Structure 1
């Protein structure tokens, strides 16, 4: 094991850091091994983890009570893994989002725990010269800076590392603090308009859908995600959540009220996957809402990519497995069955072994929580799928 080797020879850590090292290290190493990453990339990922992530994770879990109300996951685990299924039975892409913490979190010097993420981004920029920080600083000052603004989701920023087989990408997520006169969408839209975009036609499409369309008026934007590459090549993901959960609503959102055409085949496959992943009756009417779940992150959630060189925005929908499925094994078998039916499930067993590694001992088939979302994007006539995973440090405290 790469982690066993590194842990054997790297200098020992303090109690808290060692706990994070011996927990996150094996988890990341297992996910990367099952996805067939070469050895050097596993060493690199664990060396980065040991040097720049583990020291900034704060005190180790000691109970089921979390030290913060982090918006990363429902149980406030500050780590979320993701497993992107690549078509053609190619190797999956492993990514992980992290919200680092410091003792200053909550104080006047850092009331919303932003400094650790900024430090991580600059540290990564030192080692990765291809990283561009122009949009990082622009959106940082616009959304979280001294000029920005009561109501908070539990976090305001976090970062993600994407191991794209041979190179590393970094993403940054901003969760604006809302005030009675400055909602999250107002701040995000103003920041994008002030970012120097060549064409803002897709942003206007998203704005018109959100403001005027009956279904689009039911969505509440809350988060913005950018890529730390050249701004012409970076995506602009605008996340929005709604209380409605019927697939008729989900479908209308995927098409942005009919703006996007030629998606009938993809949406049919989406409908099948939605029902299988959630364990719904095959004849469930698309106009029926899902049974009510009352939670901060319940309902249907999406993101709109308003990227340049594309006048029509793209939509990714997230199937909230943790809130509406029966149990993790059932949702996993539905996803894997869909993949098998379309000849895209070469890494299904590897994925199941990863779930077994991540799951709290004896809970896959009786509870939810491990798989947070199944992300679905429509690519022509096929689906692009991603599994998001919560290690559940506190809800499953061992």
Structure 2
């Protein structure tokens, strides 16, 4: 596993962002303000991760053309409270913003997470944001080669509410009281070659409310129905058997995601949240109750233990987040830990697990110091030396003694004898 690139880039206006900024005519004030609040962070991420210049420009232009209009209204500041939020509170970030850039610091790859929204999203005209995500994926599909939507349609049919089911949730608003209303989210994985890999995420909590089927049964029946070839059947069965063991409760099946490629090559990730945030519970999940203890499983768990200590995670029993914690809102915010399970079409009996720890509310500078300690432990030299100062460079006017919102989640997997660490960070500067 070749160590990740990390070049320094602290510049407040990186050259590609300026070059485009001085050339773009925006047909919307919102698109213009979004750009100036996020494009500098994207541009820095791209040059620090050592993407080629041509590819930097491809992606900043794509950001401009495809993403900006899908971000909807620019966030607004409350005069007296100072809190800055958008009317639709996205399930993608705890700040509720519809945009997030994530940094795979094991490979130096950037991903753009987008909750496609309109001015009507959240309001009476569209209270569950049904159509705009689809339109976004459809547009991405015609623009971007290799983007195959067959998996999205199959899951949309099973996992997203129909127009009648909406009416039931409008007529009777007591049946779905959660403010987390996002059904679909998107992600574009930006490869070094210029190719974009698109993923869709499905959150069927509203379909659950209207049909009386639990989130688990929806996810599993969905996956099981779409899986014609039965490539996921073994891993899925054993994940179910594990969720069964756990129910006989703190483990909660939450959502899934799928890639958008040829069906017989497609791969799904099943997400579950866990509220006992402690290292004995991580082992239980990581090893499926001690059933999955091959060398690779245990070697990864030893390293997971090192990671957990290095970033200084606190143990605890943490309940699902009450509302949101938007910019201006104060965080020491505590939330649940999370796992995805990778249904990969291999012959492995168990799908590969990936841990997501919510670090939102932990001092972000401190957290990144702990990560640096971890980068050194695994010999990621360039990243050890340069990442922290690139991290802080994205939040120029911010106070890092108080700031605990800059990193929201960190994920850990073990792939090819190596740690895989991804930071999900604050992607917005007013």
User: What is the aligned counterpart of 1:376 among 412, 417, 420?
Assistant: 412
Q: 2:124, 2:317 → 1: CA distance?
A: 42
After superposition, what is the alpha-carbon deviation per residue over 1:288-346, rounded to whole angstroms, capped at 9, x for unaligned?
x42757735812111111222243211000121114x3x11111111111111221242
Which segments of 5 or more consecutive residues in structure 2 lack a partner in the other structure? 1-14, 78-82, 166-174, 323-333
After superposition, what is the alpha-carbon deviation per residue over 1:124-145, rounded to whole angstroms, capped at 9, x for unaligned?
1112231111111100111114
Q: 1:308, 1:259 → 2: CA distance?
A: 20
- CA contact 2:275–2:318 (8 Å) conserved in 1: no
* 1:158-177 matches, cutoff 5 A: 158-166=185-193, 167-176=195-204, 177=206
Matched, 1:77 2:97: yes
The aligned counterpart of 2:267 is: 235
> Aligned with 1:232: secondary structure?
helix
The aligned counterpart of 1:366 is: 402
Q: 1:80, 1:14 → 2: CA distance?
A: 21
Q: CA deviation at 1:28?
A: 0.8
Matched, 1:26 2:40: yes
* 1:245-324 matches, cutoff 5 A: 245-261=277-293, 262=295, 263-278=297-312, 289-290=315-316, 295-296=321-322, 298-310=335-347, 311-323=349-361
Matched, 1:179 2:209: yes
Q: 1:236, 1:294 → 2: CA distance?
A: 24
Seen in structure 2, the aligned counterparts of structure 1 residues 77 and 354 have a Cα distance that, compared at 3 Å, is: farther
The aligned counterpart of 1:194 is: 225
Which segments of 5 or more consecutive residues in structure 1 lack a partner in the other structure? 281-288
- CA contact 1:17–1:54 (8 Å) conserved in 2: yes
C-alpha RMSD over aligned residues:
2.3
Q: 1:24, 1:157 → 2: CA distance?
A: 22
Seen in structure 2, the aligned counterparts of structure 1 residues 129 and 218 have a Cα distance that, compared at 3 Å, is: same
- CA contact 1:222–1:240 (8 Å) conserved in 2: yes
> Aligned with 1:131: secondary structure?
coil
* 1:335-350 matches, cutoff 5 A: 335-350=371-386
Structure-2-length-normalised TM-score: 0.82
- CA contact 1:141–1:147 (8 Å) conserved in 2: no
- CA contact 1:279–1:334 (8 Å) conserved in 2: no
The aligned counterpart of 1:210 is: 243
Count residues in correspondence. 379
User: What is the aligned counterpart of 1:53 among 67, 82, 91?
Assistant: 67
Q: 1:370, 1:154 → 2: CA distance?
A: 23
- CA contact 2:273–2:338 (8 Å) conserved in 1: yes
Q: 2:48, 2:156 → 1: CA distance?
A: 35
- CA contact 2:408–2:424 (8 Å) conserved in 1: yes
- CA contact 1:142–1:148 (8 Å) conserved in 2: no
Q: Which runs of 4+ in 1 moved over 6 A?
A: none
The aligned counterpart of 2:182 is: 155
Seen in structure 2, the aligned counterparts of structure 1 residues 268 and 196 have a Cα distance that, compared at 3 Å, is: closer
